[PDB]
Amino acid sequence: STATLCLGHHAVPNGTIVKTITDDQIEVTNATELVQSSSTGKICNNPHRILDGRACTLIDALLGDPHCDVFQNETWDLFVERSNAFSNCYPYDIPDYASLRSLVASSGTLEFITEGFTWTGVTQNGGSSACKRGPANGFFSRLNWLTKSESAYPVLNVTMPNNDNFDKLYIWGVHHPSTNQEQTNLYVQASGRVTVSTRRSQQTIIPNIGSRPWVRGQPGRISIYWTIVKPGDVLVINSNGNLIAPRGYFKMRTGKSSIMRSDAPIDTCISECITPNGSIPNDKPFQNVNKITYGACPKYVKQNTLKLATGMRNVPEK
Amino acid sequence: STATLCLGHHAVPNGTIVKTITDDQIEVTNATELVQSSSTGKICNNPHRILDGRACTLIDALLGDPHCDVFQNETWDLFVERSNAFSNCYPYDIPDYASLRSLVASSGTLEFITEGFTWTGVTQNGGSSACKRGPANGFFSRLNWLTKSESAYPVLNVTMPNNDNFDKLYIWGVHHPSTNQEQTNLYVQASGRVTVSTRRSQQTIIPNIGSRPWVRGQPGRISIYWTIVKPGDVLVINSNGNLIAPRGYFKMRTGKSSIMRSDAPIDTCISECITPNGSIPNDKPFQNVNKITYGACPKYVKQNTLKLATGMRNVPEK
Amino acid sequence: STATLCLGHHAVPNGTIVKTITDDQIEVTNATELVQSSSTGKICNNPHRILDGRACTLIDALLGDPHCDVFQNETWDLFVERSNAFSNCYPYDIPDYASLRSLVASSGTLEFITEGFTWTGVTQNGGSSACKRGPANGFFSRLNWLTKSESAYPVLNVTMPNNDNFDKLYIWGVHHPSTNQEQTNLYVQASGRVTVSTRRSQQTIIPNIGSRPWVRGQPGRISIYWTIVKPGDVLVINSNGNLIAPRGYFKMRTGKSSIMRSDAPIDTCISECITPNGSIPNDKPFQNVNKITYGACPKYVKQNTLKLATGMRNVPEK
Amino acid sequence: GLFGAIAGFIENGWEGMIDGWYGFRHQNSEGTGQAADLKSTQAAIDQINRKLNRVIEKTNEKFHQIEKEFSEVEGRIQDLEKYVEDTKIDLWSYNAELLVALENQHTIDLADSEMNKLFEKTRRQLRENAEDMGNGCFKIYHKCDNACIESIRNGTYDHDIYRDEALNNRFQ
Amino acid sequence: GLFGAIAGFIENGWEGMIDGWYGFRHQNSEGTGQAADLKSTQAAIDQINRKLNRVIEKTNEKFHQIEKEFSEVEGRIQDLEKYVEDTKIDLWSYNAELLVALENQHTIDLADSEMNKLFEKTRRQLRENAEDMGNGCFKIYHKCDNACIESIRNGTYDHDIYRDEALNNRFQ
Amino acid sequence: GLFGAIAGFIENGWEGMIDGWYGFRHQNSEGTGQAADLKSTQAAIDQINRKLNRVIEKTNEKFHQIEKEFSEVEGRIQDLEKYVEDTKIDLWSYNAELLVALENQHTIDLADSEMNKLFEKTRRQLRENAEDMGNGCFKIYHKCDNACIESIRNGTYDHDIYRDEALNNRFQ
C-alpha cells in the first residue's frame, strides 16, 4: 500500500581524526597527510649537480690544500661538506670565513685561471712541512709564498688588469711570523705590509709577530683575504714583506649553486628536494624533516602531522 | 484557474573569472582587482619632499664633492640617487659605506654647522688636481686637508665640546700616501696616526703607505670615518700626521626621511606611495611593481593579479 | 481549537560589538578579548630566576667593576639592566659590545674560575684612581693590569690549556696610553702588542696612543676583547707591552637565559611572561603591551582590542 | 546569517529568555508559556566553546632573541634588526585581524544554523498537524494543552493522535 | 554552493533581469511578467560591499627600511638581508592567495544563501495555496492576477483570501 | 555540520554502502534495497578533490639561503640569523595549522550540504505523494515497486501518476 524511501550517506569501520575550527579532534571517513615527515636517508645524486667534499671543506678546496687538489676547478649545484673533513696544510685563519664560504658556494665553481706573476726580487713557492706535498714541503696550490731573494725583500708593486667581461675573484694572504728573528730572516724588513687595491676598493693588512699554538709544527699563521675586480678595473698588489701572493683568479658566476653540511650518503635516484637528512618528496605542502633545505621543498613546520580531510564526517552506528 | 510564479537570480554575458577554495577557476558576474600592477612611470613631486641627487650621490653631497655643493644644507623626505651619478673628487674609501649612507639618509638633513677648530702648527685647506673646484685644485667642502708648516707637523690635540641639546655627526678621515717620500714630505713623521674620541667612543686609525691604481691621477686614497658626539659630551682629535680634519658637524634628526635608487622622472602630481619604477596608487591591498617602497604602500606580492569576487556565480542561459 | 507554538532565540539589553568578514561592526550577545592590553607594572619573581642588575650593567659585572662585585659568580634566567646603572671603574671600550653582552646574557652565568697565570718579569695588579676599591686605587676584578718591573717589560708568552670537557670564555684586553712618555714609562717599549690565539683563532691587537677626553680623570682607555677555548685547545697570550691580563675564565653554558632592560620593580608573584612594562597573563593569544618578551608569551600585534564572538547576533526585542 | 533565521525570518530576540539561547513560547486553551530548549542551546555552546579553546590555551616560549630598542644610531645591521621585528609584527597583526574576522563570521552563521535546525526539527515533528506562519511560529491546528506542547518540546509528540482533528481544521 | 539554489535547483540565471540580483517571473490569466526583488538584491550588495571595503581601504606606511638590491657581492650579511625580504614576500603572497580564496568561497555561498532566503520567504507567504515545482517555481493553485502577484512580491499577500479556492484545486 | 543532515537528522551512516557517499534505502512491497547516488556522490568528490589539489601540487624553490646551524658562539649577527629563521618557522606553522582547520571545517559542512541537497532534490520530486518522517526517510503514500523507486533515484518519477492514489492515503 505505502512505501518508504530513506536517504543516507556512508561511514567506514575505522575513520580518521582531523582538526577543524570547532574541534581539535573529530573523525572523518578519510584524510591525507600534508606534512612530509620521513626521509630515505640519502641524497639523490640528481637534477642537482652534487659534489661530495669527502674530506675537504669548500674553503680548503678553494685554497688548494694538497689532499683537496682533486677538487681543482670542480663545479656544483650543491657542495656537501662532511663532518669529518679536516685541514692538513699550513695553519690559516680567515677574517669573515663565513662570507667567503658563502659567496664561493653561491658561485658554484672553482674555475681557476693562473695569471702572469711578476715577482721580481723575491723567492717564490715557499713551503712548509705542515703542508707536505708528497715527501716535500708544500703549500696551498693557489697561493704563492714569497720570501727574500739575495738578502733583500723588494717593495713589491704588481698590476693585473681585468680586461675580461666577468668579475675576477682574487684570494691572497699575509703571513704572521712567530718571532722577530723569523720576520727579518724571512722578509728582512722588521715590519711587513700588504696592500691590495683597485679603483673601487683598498685593503691594507699589517703582519703581527708573536707565538701561537703549534699546528702541525707551526707557530706562525696566514690570514686570508679576497678581492673582486670588476671589468674595466685593475688589481694592484703593493708589499715590502709578508705577502702570500695570488697565482691568478677564480671565475665568478651567479646561479643556484649552494653548500650544505650533511653526512647523508649520495645514492643514485631523483629527488627535487634535498635536506641534510637526505632527499624528500615534495608532493606535500609542508615537511618536518629539517629547516635546512635545497631545491623545490615543502615549507618546514613544527607540526609533525597535519591531516587534510578528504571525506565527510564519519558517523558509525551504535 | 492557476497562476505560476518562478523565482530567479540574474547572470551576465561576459562574466569574470575568480579563484576559490574548491575551484582555482570559476566564473562570477563581477570582481575587483586587488594587485596594483601598474605605474605612471614617474615619481610625484608631492606629498613627500623629494630631492633628486642628479649626478650626486648622497655621500659625495655629504662630503662636499665640488659638483655637489648645490646640495649644501639640503633636506629630504626621500633622497633620490641616479644611476649616472659620478664622483669627481679625490679618491676615497669608507669602511662601512652602507651604514653611513643609511644613517645620513634617515636623518634626512645635510645641515652643516661650521665649528672653530684651531689647527696650530699646520697648513690647512689643502687640495688636489683630482678636486678641481673650478679650474684650480680643491677638496671636499666639509673636510680640511692638513699639512706640515715650517718643516714640522705637531702632535695635534683639539677639543670640541657638545654643549647643545642635540647629537652631532662629525665626519673626518685619514690620508694614505702613495709612498714613504710622500708621507715624510707632507707630514714629516714617517708614520702618521689619527685618534678621534669622546667619553664614549674611541677610534684610532693608522695611515697605510702604498701604491694604488690612479684615480683622476692619484695613487693615494683617503679613508673616511664618522663620529657621533652626544649632548654633554666632547670631541677630541689627536694626530701627528695624515689627518683630514672636520670643519664642523651635521645636525642629526629623526623622522621618515629615506633614500631610494631610481631613474624615474619627477613630475608634479600627488601620490602617497613611491617606488623605484615611479609612484603608484594605494587603493589596492597588494602590488607587483617593485618590493622597494616608500610611503603608504600596498604590500608587494609575487602574484600579478588577484580578483576579489563582488557578485554571485555566473550561470548563463546557454 | 488550535494552538500556537513559536520558536526563538535570546537577546541581550546591551550586547557586544565585533568585526566579521562583512561587518567591521556588528553586534553579538557575548565576546571575549583576544588582546592582553594591560600589565601589572611589576615583574614576578619566579617561574624564572630573575637577577636585578641594580646599578650594574651585565658587562661591568662581568669585568668586575668594584660596585658590581656583588654579582660575582651570580646566575640568572633573566638579567635585568636598569636605566640608571653607571660605571665607576677605569674608562673602557668594547668592540662589538653588543655581541659580548649577548653571549654572556645567553650563557646566564658569571662563574669565574681563576687560573694560575705565569707573569714573569712584570708588575701585576695594576689599578687607577678611576676605579677606587675602598680608599685605594683598584681595577676590574677579573683583569690584571701588567706594567714594567725592574726596568724592563718581557716578551710575555704564556700558555693555558683547556683540559676540561667544557668551553672557556677568556676576557682580556689592551691598554691605550695617553702619550708616548706614558707608553715607554709603563711598558718600556715605544710600541706595545697583544696576541691571543688558539689552534682555531688569533687576535693580534695593537695599542693606540693619544689623548682622549678625561673620564674619571683618565685620558687613557682599555679596549676589551674575548676568546673561546674549546676542550682540547690551549690559549697562548703573547705580548711585549700594553696587555690587560685575564685572571681565569668564565664557564659557558646553554639554556634559556637572557637579558632585558627595564625599570620595573620585582615582585613576589608567579608569571610566565615578562615584558619591560612588567609581567603579564598568557591566557590570551595576543598582546599589545611591548614587543620585547620573555617566557611563555602572547604574540605582539598592533591592535589594542580584538574581540572573539562567543554568542549569536544580538537582535533587541521590539 | 547564511540561514536567515536569526535576524531574518525571526523578527526579534527574547530578552525574557534567560535559561537558554533558543526556546519555545506558546499560546493555547490554557494560556501562554515559555521554555528554553536545552538540547539546542547546549549544542551551540559546546561548539563555540571548542572554537574558543583552540585559540586560548595556546602560546609558545621564546627566551634569548634579538634586541629591539636602540640607544645609538648604527646603520645597516640595526636597520635589518628593526625591519625583521617590524615585518614579524605586521604579519602577526594581520593574522590576528583575519582570525577573528573569519572566526566571528563563522560563529554568527553557526548560531543561526543551530536556530534553523531547531525549527526544522520542530516542523518535522508536527508533520501535517501544523503550518509555518512564516515568522518562526507554527500554527498547530488542534487543541494542544500544556502537556501536548511539552511533548513537542521534549520530542515525544505523537502526530497520529491529532492528525484527523488537525486535517479537518486545515482543510475545511 | 552550500545552498544549492544558484547553479543548483534553479537551472540557470536570467540575463534579462537587469534591474536586480533577484526577482520573479510569472505566467497568469493576464499574461507573463518579470520584476526584480529589491530588498533581496540590496541585501546581497550591502554584504559584499562591506566585505570589499574591509580589504581595500587598508595600507601601511613604511619609510626607511632595509636595502633590497645590491651592486656588489658581500656574503653573510647580504644573504640575511635577502632571505629576510624574500621570506616576508612569500608570506604575504600566501596571505593574499588565501585571502581571496577564502573570501571568494564565502562570497559565492552568500549569494546562494540570499537566493534561497528569498525562496523560503516566498514559499512561507504562499502557505497551502501553492506548490514548489522544484525548478525554482511555485505553482499557485488559484487565480493570482497582477494585483495578487504584486501583493506577493511586496509581501502583502493574504493566504486566507485564496485558501479555499486553492485547496479545492489541489486536493481534487 | 551547518546543515544538520549528517550526524544530525540522519541518525547515522551506512557501512554497507561501499560504492558511494550518499544513497537511498527502501522497503517496498518487493522487500528492501540499497543503491548509491552517483550524481550526488561525485559532486562531493569532485569538489573535495579540487580543494585538495589547490594544496598539493604546490611548492616553491629556494637554493642559496642563510645558514641555520652554528658550531661556535658569535653574538649579534647570529642571533638575528636565528630569530629570522625561527620567526619564519612559526609564521608558517601557524599558516599550516589554520589552513587544515579552516579547510576541514569547510569540508565537513560541504559534505553535509551535499547530503541535504540530495534530500531536498528528492522531497521536491515526490511532491504531495510523500511525507518527511523526520529521519531522512520519506513515507511514499502509494504502492511503489522497484521500478517506481528506480524512477525516483534516476529522477524520472512522474508525481501525477500517483497523486490521486497518494492524496487518498494521506488524507483519509
Ligand SMILES: *[C@@H]1O[C@H](CO)[C@@H](O[C@@H]2O[C@H](CO)[C@@H](O[C@@H]3O[C@H](CO)[C@@H](O)[C@H](O[C@H]4O[C@H](CO)[C@@H](O)[C@H](O)[C@@H]4O)[C@@H]3O)[C@H](O)[C@H]2NC(C)=O)[C@H](O)[C@H]1NC(C)=O
Ligand atoms: C710560547 O709558549 C708556547 C706554548 O707553550 C711555546 O710553544 C711550544 O713550543 C715547544 C718547543 O718550542 C713545542 O714542543 C714540541 O712539542 C711537540 C709535541 O706536540 C714535540 O713534537 C716536539 O718535539 C721535541 O721532542 C721530540 C721527542 O720525541 C724530539 O724528536 C724533537 O726534536 C723535540 O725535541 C717539542 O717538544 C710545543 O709544541 C709548543 N706548545 C704549544 C702550546 O704550541 C713557545 O715555545 C713559546 N714561545 C717561545 C718561542 O719561547
Ligand SMILES: *[C@@H]1O[C@H](CO)[C@@H](O[C@@H]2O[C@H](CO)[C@@H](O[C@@H]3O[C@H](CO)[C@@H](O)[C@H](O[C@H]4O[C@H](CO)[C@@H](O)[C@H](O)[C@@H]4O)[C@@H]3O)[C@H](O)[C@H]2NC(C)=O)[C@H](O)[C@H]1NC(C)=O
Ligand atoms: C705600481 O704599479 C702601478 C700600476 O702600473 C703604477 O701606477 C701607474 O703609474 C704610471 C706612472 O708611472 C701611470 O701612468 C700614467 O698613465 C696615464 C694614462 O691615462 C697618464 O695620464 C700619465 O701621463 C704621463 O705621460 C704622458 C705622456 O705624454 C704625459 O703627457 C703626462 O704628463 C704624464 O707624464 C701617466 O703615463 C699609470 O696610469 C699607473 N697605473 C695605474 C693603473 O695606476 C705605480 O706607479 C707603481 N708604483 C710605483 C710608484 O712604482
Ligand SMILES: *[C@@H]1O[C@H](CO)[C@@H](O[C@@H]2O[C@H](CO)[C@@H](O[C@@H]3O[C@H](CO)[C@@H](O)[C@H](O[C@H]4O[C@H](CO)[C@@H](O)[C@H](O)[C@@H]4O)[C@@H]3O)[C@H](O)[C@H]2NC(C)=O)[C@H](O)[C@H]1NC(C)=O
Ligand atoms: C688634549 O686635549 C685634552 C682635552 O682638551 C686635554 O685634556 C684636558 O686636560 C686638562 C688637564 O691637563 C683637564 O683639566 C682637568 O679638569 C678637571 C675638571 O673636573 C680638574 O678637576 C683638573 O684639575 C687639575 O688642574 C687644577 C688647576 O685648576 C688643579 O687645581 C688640580 O689639582 C688638578 O691638577 C683639571 O683642571 C681637562 O679636563 C682635560 N679635558 C678633557 C675633556 O679631557 C689634554 O691635556 C690635551 N693633551 C695634552 C697632553 O696636552
Ligand SMILES: CC(=O)N[C@@H]1[C@@H](O[C@@H]2O[C@H](CO)[C@H](O)[C@H](O[C@]3(C(=O)O)C[C@H](O)[C@@H](NC(C)=O)[C@H]([C@H](O)[C@H](O)CO)O3)[C@H]2O)[C@H](O)[C@@H](CO)O[C@H]1O
Ligand atoms: C729549517 C729547519 O729545519 N730548521 C730546524 C728548526 O726548525 C725550523 O723552525 C722554524 C721556526 O723557527 C720553522 O718552523 C721551520 O719550518 C718551516 C716550515 O714551515 O716547514 C720550514 C719552511 O722552509 C719555512 N717556509 C718558508 C718559505 O719560510 C717555514 C716558515 O719559514 C715558517 O713557518 C715561518 O713562519 O718554516 C722549521 O724547520 C728547529 O727549530 C731546530 C731544532 O732542532 O733544527 C733546525 O734544523
Ligand SMILES: CC(=O)N[C@@H]1[C@@H](O[C@@H]2O[C@H](CO)[C@H](O)[C@H](O[C@]3(C(=O)O)C[C@H](O)[C@@H](NC(C)=O)[C@H]([C@H](O)[C@H](O)CO)O3)[C@H]2O)[C@H](O)[C@@H](CO)O[C@H]1O
Ligand atoms: C697623585 C697626583 O695627583 N699626581 C699628579 C700626576 O698625576 C698622574 O698623571 C698620570 C698621567 O701623566 C696619571 O693620570 C696618573 O694616574 C694613574 C691612575 O690612573 O690612577 C696612576 C696609576 O698608578 C696608574 N696606574 C698604572 C697601572 O699605571 C695610572 C695609569 O698609568 C694611567 O691611568 C694610564 O692612562 O695613572 C696620575 O696620578 C700628574 O701627572 C702631575 C701633573 O699634572 O701632577 C701630579 O700632582
Ligand SMILES: CC(=O)N[C@H]1[C@H]([C@H](O)[C@H](O)CO)O[C@@](O[C@@H]2[C@@H](O)[C@H](O)O[C@H](CO)[C@@H]2O)(C(=O)O)C[C@@H]1O
Ligand atoms: C694637500 C696636497 O699636498 N696636495 C697635493 C697632493 C698630495 O700631496 C698627494 O695627493 C698625496 O698623496 O698631490 C697632488 O698631486 C701631485 C702632483 O702635483 C705631482 O705632479 O705628482 C705627485 C705624484 O707624486 C702628485 O700626484 C694632488 O693630489 O693634486 C698635488 C697637490 O698639490
Ligand SMILES: *[C@@H]1O[C@H](CO)[C@@H](O[C@@H]2O[C@H](CO)[C@@H](O)[C@H](O)[C@H]2NC(C)=O)[C@H](O)[C@H]1NC(C)=O
Ligand atoms: C681549470 O683547471 C685546470 C687545472 O686542472 C686549468 O689548467 C691549467 O691551465 C693552464 C693555462 O691556463 C696551464 O698552464 C696549466 O698547466 C693547466 N693545469 C694543469 C697542468 O692541469 C684550467 O685552465 C682551468 N680552467 C677552467 C675550466 O676554469
Ligand SMILES: *[C@@H]1O[C@H](CO)[C@@H](O[C@@H]2O[C@H](CO)[C@@H](O)[C@H](O)[C@H]2NC(C)=O)[C@H](O)[C@H]1NC(C)=O
Ligand atoms: C634531521 O636531522 C637533524 C640534524 O640536523 C636531526 O637532529 C635534531 O636536531 C635538532 C636541532 O635543531 C635537535 O633539537 C634535536 O634534538 C635533533 N633530533 C634528534 C632527536 O636527534 C633531526 O632529528 C632529523 N629529523 C629527522 C626527520 O630524522
Ligand SMILES: *[C@@H]1O[C@H](CO)[C@@H](O)[C@H](O)[C@H]1NC(C)=O
Ligand atoms: C582519501 O582521499 C585520497 C585523495 O583525496 C585518496 O587517494 C585515498 O584513497 C582516500 N582514502 C582511501 C584509502 O579511500
Ligand SMILES: *[C@@H]1O[C@H](CO)[C@@H](O)[C@H](O)[C@H]1NC(C)=O
Ligand atoms: C566586474 O567584473 C569584471 C571582471 O572582474 C571587472 O574587470 C570589472 O572591473 C568589475 N567591475 C568593476 C569596474 O569594478
Ligand SMILES: *[C@@H]1O[C@H](CO)[C@@H](O)[C@H](O)[C@H]1NC(C)=O
Ligand atoms: C647651513 O645651515 C646652518 C643652519 O643649520 C647655517 O648656520 C649655515 O650657515 C648654513 N650654511 C650655508 C651654506 O648656508
Ligand SMILES: *[C@@H]1O[C@H](CO)[C@@H](O)[C@H](O)[C@H]1NC(C)=O
Ligand atoms: C620595476 O623596476 C625593477 C628594477 O628595480 C625592474 O626590474 C622591474 O622589471 C620593474 N617592473 C615594473 C613594475 O615595471
Ligand SMILES: *[C@@H]1O[C@H](CO)[C@@H](O)[C@H](O)[C@H]1NC(C)=O
Ligand atoms: C560570555 O558571557 C557568558 C554568560 O552566559 C559567560 O558564561 C562566558 O564566560 C562569556 N563568554 C566567554 C566564553 O568568555
Ligand SMILES: *[C@@H]1O[C@H](CO)[C@@H](O)[C@H](O)[C@H]1NC(C)=O
Ligand atoms: C666565585 O667566587 C668565589 C669567591 O667569592 C670563588 O671561590 C669561586 O670559585 C667562584 N665560582 C666558582 C665556583 O668558580
Ligand SMILES: *[C@@H]1O[C@H](CO)[C@@H](O)[C@H](O)[C@H]1NC(C)=O
Ligand atoms: C514530554 O511531555 C509529556 C506530556 O507533558 C510527558 O508525559 C513526557 O514524560 C515528557 N517527556 C520528556 C522526556 O520530557
Ligand SMILES: *[C@@H]1O[C@H](CO)[C@@H](O)[C@H](O)[C@H]1NC(C)=O
Ligand atoms: C502590493 O501590491 C498591491 C497590488 O499592486 C498593492 O495594492 C499594495 O499596496 C502593495 N503593497 C506594498 C506595500 O507594496
